[PDB]
Amino acid sequence: DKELKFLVVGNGGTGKSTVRNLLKELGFNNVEDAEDGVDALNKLQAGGYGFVISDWNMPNMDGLELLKTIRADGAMSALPVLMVTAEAKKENIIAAAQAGASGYVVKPFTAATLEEKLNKIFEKLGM
């Protein structure tokens, strides 16, 4: 369903766009936003989301702490999380894998790339 709810945490810029704008071309209109990990966790208690897209670098609470926290929450631990960054570091990619992320993408990227990503995650999660 194109009725799947996204939560776009962080700045969300992509180079010539924004995550929320690229989602609309793929057909995903049901999206809300958060500014950092703390804002994200508050909104997440309202319940009803099905996928999260987050920045690595954010103020107050970064992408990694956010991710270990969603994974420990017995209520949303099976929640899909795709990491977004503009600095590719082996050490950050390793850390995100063992912490339980569903993917990793390096900006700038286009609608093409986000589609291959989303699809691959839908398949390995079976949804």
Side-chain angles (χ1 to χ4, degrees):
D1 58 323
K2 278 51 190 44
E3 282 301 315
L4 179 67
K5 226 193 193 310
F6 286 85
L7 174 70
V8 180
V9 191
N11 140 270
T14 62
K16 301 168 186 184
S17 243
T18 181
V19 178
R20 169 159 200 160
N21 260 69
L22 298 175
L23 281 176
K24 196 180 67 56
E25 312 184 337
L26 301 180
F28 297 104
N29 278 355
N30 209 350
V31 185
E32 267 187 55
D33 36 57
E35 31 180 69
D36 62 46
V38 173
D39 182 24
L41 288 175
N42 180 61
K43 288 207 189 79
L44 283 171
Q45 298 297 306
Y49 292 97
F51 203 127
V52 183
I53 296 187
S54 166
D55 262 37
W56 196 255
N57 274 32
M58 305 179 294
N60 300 313
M61 190 195 260
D62 66 45
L64 194 63
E65 217 172 61
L66 171 65
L67 166 65
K68 305 180 172 173
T69 304
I70 289 185
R71 285 297 175 253
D73 197 305
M76 54 198 177
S77 56
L79 203 68
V81 177
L82 168 71
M83 293 308 316
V84 164
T85 320
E87 170 57 74
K89 218 70 179 167
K90 309 223 164 157
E91 210 165 77
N92 299 343
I93 312 188
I94 288 191
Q98 321 242 95
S102 307
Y104 199 101
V105 65
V106 188
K107 302 159 157 180
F109 56 83
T110 43
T113 315
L114 184 52
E115 184 174 39
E116 199 58 75
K117 258 52 210 306
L118 296 183
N119 285 339
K120 277 205 173 282
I121 312 190
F122 288 152
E123 286 160 13
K124 96 178 164 186
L125 290 185
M127 65 204 271

